[PDB]
């Protein structure tokens, strides 16, 4: 199902500053990851954190519910990109808590800029990605819901007035993706090496946020760049990464992005 | 006392709530110390912490002149007591950031109750102590490198009599090697409430140890008094738990 705003609660800045202070300092425990990302599980039965610097506690308790919501966590990301990929009826809500301008999300053909307070529905089964082109903080609250007991996206709210499904979204404009531009991306066939394969993967993954092209093409480009490079082991690895990212196809155990 | 107020500043208890929340959750990890204490390095002679503490950062930046700013950190203390000592035989200022009613500092012959925002100078050369008789947070900004006549809260202590001294030496009937430390910390607290020089803590401990008839206790007490009152260094073989 396509991504869309479910509603939009207003956020009490000062009442919420100390909660972000906490979350930023909580240490939590320690692949295809880059940059800074971080999670603080809030619901999993609460956690030692809930009580710790509240407010969000209120929100997830005053805004949502129903006998089932199987999760909840903070989720920050600075100067990072998570490559496009599908995770595999498992609802999932996302709410950014602060103003981070160069922070975006993508899902199949769309690119969105979440604003403070909006509650978005995101689908796990589709090809998605997230990014932060800058170091400005982007703390978010994420709440997943449990179903297969037939629903209406309204019934995730404990109070149905919060539900406002028509708020318009910030959909960034993207430049047309020309054929000249595709050929230039293929020019990386000249410079890709096994020691920078991973770096190129991350670079290609960024293109769709600015240009009008499906993000799954990231993988087609990488495979072609690989063939242009004449490196057979690279071609094979770029094909496995693509089968893993858009096909959920399990990657071998011992599979390594940096040991060919 | 050689310590005194250096001029207040009133804290914006709203830009400060989040910083306090930051300082309280960060991991930091860390002999005569007991209870709860935690320090957050801010400026060493600047850290990943400074920018997540916007307001605190503003204050050390503009209220202070770095033309000799050695360093600054945050120091918290709950149900804790720093035994009275003199550091040796620089310039330290201290600013409590929260109202913790049962948190006190003492120096030579007076006891102080720092109120939020005041900027104090604490002398390291004379016998000093700090304590928090409760759990109420007492987050403080310590900056090591203007209104002096400001009136400080200098609690008024009760008279320390010979009768009280005697009750105190009754501890000689219960001291044991396993509660020696506890009694040290208990004794260290008397001067906050009673008008008696903090150093006398060590004289009671020594007199208590002698009445106990435990020579290893007497020698230990002497070592603590020399370390605390005379700044003599203890061995690395020294311990309050290993006899
Ligand atoms: Fe995912
Ligand atoms: Fe000291």
Swiss-Prot record, chain A:
2-oxoglutarate binds at residue 138. Fe cation binds at residues 85, 87, 128. The keyword Ribonucleoprotein does not apply. It is an enzyme of class 1 (oxidoreductase). Inhibited by metal ions such as Co(2+), Zn(2+), Ni(2+) or Cu(2+). Is also inhibited by EDTA in vitro. It catalyses: L-proline + 2-oxoglutarate + O2 = cis-3-hydroxy-L-proline + succinate + CO2. Its EC number is 1.14.11.28. Disulfide bonds: none annotated. Keywords: Dioxygenase, Iron, Metal-binding, Oxidoreductase. Pfam families: Asp_Arg_Hydrox, Pro_3_hydrox_C. Binds 1 Fe(2+) ion. Optimum pH is 6.0. Is stable from pH 5.5 to 9.0. Optimum temperature is 40 degrees Celsius. Is stable below 40 degrees Celsius. InterPro entries: Asp/Arg/Pro-Hydrxlase, IPNS-like_sf, Pro_3_hydrox_C, Pro_3_hydrox_C_sf. SUPFAM superfamilies: Clavaminate synthase-like. Its cofactor is Fe(2+). The keyword Oxidoreductase applies. One of its GO terms (molecular function) is proline 3-hydroxylase activity. Dioxygenase that catalyzes the 2-oxoglutarate-dependent selective hydroxylation of free L-proline to cis-3-hydroxy-L-proline (cis-3-Hyp). Belongs to the L-proline cis-4-/cis-3-hydroxylase family. Homodimer. This is L-proline cis-3-hydroxylase 2. It comes from Streptomyces sp.
């Amino acid at each position: 199902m396509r991504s869309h705003i479910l509603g939009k609660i207003e956020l009490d800045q000062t009442r919420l500053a100390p909660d972000l202070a906490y979350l930023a300092a909580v240490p939590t425990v320690e692949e295809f990851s880059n940059g800074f990302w971080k999670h603080v599980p809030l619901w999993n039965q609460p956690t030692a954190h809930v009580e710790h610097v509240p407010y969000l506690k209120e929100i997830v308790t005053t805004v949502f519910d129903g006998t089932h919501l199987q999760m909840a966590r903070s989720r920050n990301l600075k100067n990072a990109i998570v490559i496009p990929h599908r995770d595999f009826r498992y609802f999932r809500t996302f709410m950014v808590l602060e103003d981070s301008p160069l922070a975006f999300h993508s899902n199949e053909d769309t690119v969105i800029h979440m604003r403070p307070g909006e509650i978005w529905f995101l689908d796990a089964a589709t090809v998605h990605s997230a990014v932060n082109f800058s170091e400005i903080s982007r703390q978010s609250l994420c709440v997943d819901f449990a179903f297969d007991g037939p629903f209406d996206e309204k019934e995730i709210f404990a109070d149905a007035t919060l539900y406002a499904p028509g708020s318009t979204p910030d959909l960034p404009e993207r430049r047309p993706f020309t054929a000249e531009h595709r050929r230039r991306i293929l020019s990386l066939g000249q410079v890709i090496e096994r020691e920078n394969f991973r770096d190129i993967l991350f670079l290609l993954s960024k293109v769709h946020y600015k240009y009008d092209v499906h993000p799954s093409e990231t993988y087609d480009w990488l495979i072609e760049i690989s063939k242009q490079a004449g490196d057979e082991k690279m071609v094979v690895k770029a094909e496995q990464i693509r089968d893993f990212a858009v096909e959920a196809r399990a990657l071998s155990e011992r599979f390594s992005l940096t040991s060919w």
